[PDB]
Structure formats: structure tokens, C-alpha cells
Amino acid sequence: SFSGYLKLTDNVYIKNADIVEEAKKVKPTVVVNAANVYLKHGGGVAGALNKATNNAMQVESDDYIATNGPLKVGGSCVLSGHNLAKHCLHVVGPNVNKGEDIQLLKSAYENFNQHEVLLAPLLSAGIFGADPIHSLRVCVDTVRTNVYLAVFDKNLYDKLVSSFL
Numbered sequence: 001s002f003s004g005y006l007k008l009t010d011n012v013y014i015k016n017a018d019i020v021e022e023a024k025k026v027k028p029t030v031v032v033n034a035a036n037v038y039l040k041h042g043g044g045v046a047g048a049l050n051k052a053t054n055n056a057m058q059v060e061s062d063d064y065i066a067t068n069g070p071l072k073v074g075g076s077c078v079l080s081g082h083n084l085a086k087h088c089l090h091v092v093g094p095n096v097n098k099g100e101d102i103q104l105l106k107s108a109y110e111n112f113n114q115h116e117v118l119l120a121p122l123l124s125a126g127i128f129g130a131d132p133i134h135s136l137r138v139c140v141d142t143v144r145t146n147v148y149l150a151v152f153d154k155n156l157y158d159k160l161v162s163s164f165l
């Protein structure tokens, strides 16, 4: 039941909103988590989504890692969305503050194409160190399915919308 989004391109929408509140209110088929390779949900969007599941996401993630090993940078896995969504697509963008290649941000967003509709944050923003406006450009250039982007910070949201319109 997505509402209040501004359409940027044929398939990319954006809203100034807390992704945790959007997920609770909409219960989308897929919510994207901005994960790391070991699925340790310590801060940023990952910590927020995990806290909203009261750590059910972390317990399930630890079991995925013990059985399957870590993800690769640019890779993803599908796990339960618990109370936030039917599924959580955990996607690893490059941490350019740690020398990880920015080219891998395109590979990360390619994972979204397996799902027709997703609620997502911008990848590699925050502690991962990428420029969020560059991250939105890669999203627009790479994602072919319908993506509803939620951005918490009003100053960042206004900057993104100005660079697009």
C-alpha cells in the first residue's frame, strides 16, 4: 500500500520516510537490507531493520552464515522479512572507506532485478562511504524493476530530488 512517493523515472520512486515505518505500514513483498558480508546488523539501516524485528533477523542471519558462509561484495541472499515484509533481500554494497571497488555498486543493485517490486534504502550510503547522489544514479541506470526508495534524512532527500529534477 505504498503512498506518498515521487516518481523519478519509469520504475524508480522516492519518499522522505523512515524505511522501518514504511515496512511496518505497507508490509511489502520484499524489503532490502543494506547488509555486510557476515550479515552482522550493527548500525545504519541494517541495525534499524534488525531492532524492529527485536533481533529475530540477527538470529536467522547467524544460522544462514553458519550453514552457507559469508556473502561476496555485490552479492545477496533472500531470508524472512519477519514483521516487516514477506521477504528480506540482504544486499552487500562496497564499503569504499575500506578500499572496496565502487564498480561493485552496479553489481549490488543488479540483485534487485530478481523481484518485481521492492522497498529499499540507497546502497553504500552512510558508513559504507559512497556519495548518496552517485548511489541513486547507479540505481536508476541499473535497476529495471519497480523500486520504492525511502530516505530518512530530510536534507539528503531534498538534495537527491534537486539533482534529479
Ligand SMILES: CNc1nc2ccc(C3=C(C(=O)O)CCC3)cc2s1
Pocket (backbone or CB within 6 Å): 018, 019, 020, 044, 045, 048, 121, 125, 126, 127, 150, 151, 152, 153, 156
Ligand atoms: C530507525 N530508522 C532508521 N534508522 C536509520 C539509520 C540510518 C539511515 C541512513 C540513511 C537515510 O536514509 O537517511 C542514509 C545513511 C544511513 C536510515 C535510517 S531509518
